[PDB]
């Protein structure tokens, strides 16, 4: 469902203030485990 629409039908004279958000492409990242002290490292299954 790639369509997300909002509106403010009233005034702004009369108007459809149309907040409209369109979806797009996804992103895939390589495993990285991001330690809790900012010492981010790429994660290995053994670890």
């Amino acid at each position: 469902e790639p369509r997300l629409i909002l509106d403010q039908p009233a005034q702004h004279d009369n108007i459809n203030k149309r907040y409209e958000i369109r979806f797009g492409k996804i992103y895939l990242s390589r495993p990285t485990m991001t330690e809790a002290d900012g010492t981010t490292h790429a994660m290995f299954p053994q670890e």
Binding site: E1, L4, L6, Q8, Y19, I21
Partner: protein, 52 residues
């Protein structure tokens, strides 16, 4: 993922209504509760129940 994402697309609506009336300079990085698709999978794979 269908289930969890169908409860993902909607929390954008249920936050861009409380701010649309203020029409603030919404960050848009705070209405996206990203742990939406973490916990359903965690519970399904950990407890064993495929749902919520």
């Amino acid at each position: 993922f269908r289930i969890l994402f169908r409860k993902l697309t909607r929390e954008i609506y249920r936050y861009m209504q409380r701010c649309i009336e203020t029409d603030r300079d919404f960050n848009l990085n705070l209405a996206v509760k990203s742990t939406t698709i973490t916990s359903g999978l965690k519970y399904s794979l950990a407890t064993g129940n495929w749902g919520e």
